[PDB]
Amino acid sequence: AVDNKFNKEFQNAIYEILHLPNLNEEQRNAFFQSLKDDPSQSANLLAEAKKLNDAQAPK
Amino acid sequence: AVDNKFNKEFSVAGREIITLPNLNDPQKKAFVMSLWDDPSQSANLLAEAKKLNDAQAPK
């Protein structure tokens, strides 16, 4: 099921992590590698990335 | 090392796709997933994306 929760969360994490503007290059690459290594962790990885993005907003 | 040529090349091409302002979200998602699955397609996908972006410019 290409549209089940697992797969939608994986695709969405790739797409949304690619968008997050306040990740640096190394951090972004680490998230992508983590997604590839364990797609079951996609929603958790996205949540982690979004928090980090907000922590690293210009101030 | 996760901060490598593979993740960098994906990140650079993917960011070029998603920063094209006139694409819709489904087009950008589909291009990004194709890139994820087949890096050999990067130049092809970037060129298709740019052609669609120009065609969908505001009127």
Numbering used by the authors:
A (entry chain A), B (entry chain B): 0 to 58
Excerpt from the paper describing this PDB structure:
The first library, LL1, was designed to use minimal codon sets encoding both polar and hydrophobic amino acids (F, L, I, K, H, N, Q, and Y) for five positions on the Z domain and hydrophobic amino acids (F, L, I, V, and M) for four positions on the affibody ZSPA-1. The ability to rearrange at these positions allows decoupling of mutations despite close proximity. These results indicate that the protein interfaces of both specific and cross-reactive complexes were completely remodeled in different ways to improve affinities up to three logs (KD of LL1.c2 = 1.86 nM, original = 2.92μM) and bias specificities (KD of Z-ALL1.c4 (FILFK) with Z-BLL1.c4 (FIVM) = 2.53 nM, and with ZSPA-1 (LVIF) = 21.9μM).
We adopted the Z domain of staphylococcal protein A and its affibody binder dimer complex as a model system. We next generated libraries at the interface of a weakly associating dimer (Z+ ZSPA-1) with micromolar affinity to determine if we could affinity-mature the interface by coevolution. To clarify these inter-residue co-variations discovered from the sequence data, we determined crystal structures of 10 coevolved pairs that spanned a range of cross-reactivities and orthogonalities (5 from LL1 and 5 from LL2). From the structures, we could verify clear compensatory changes between the residues showing the most significant covariations (13A-9B / 17A-31B) in both LL1 and LL2 library mutants.
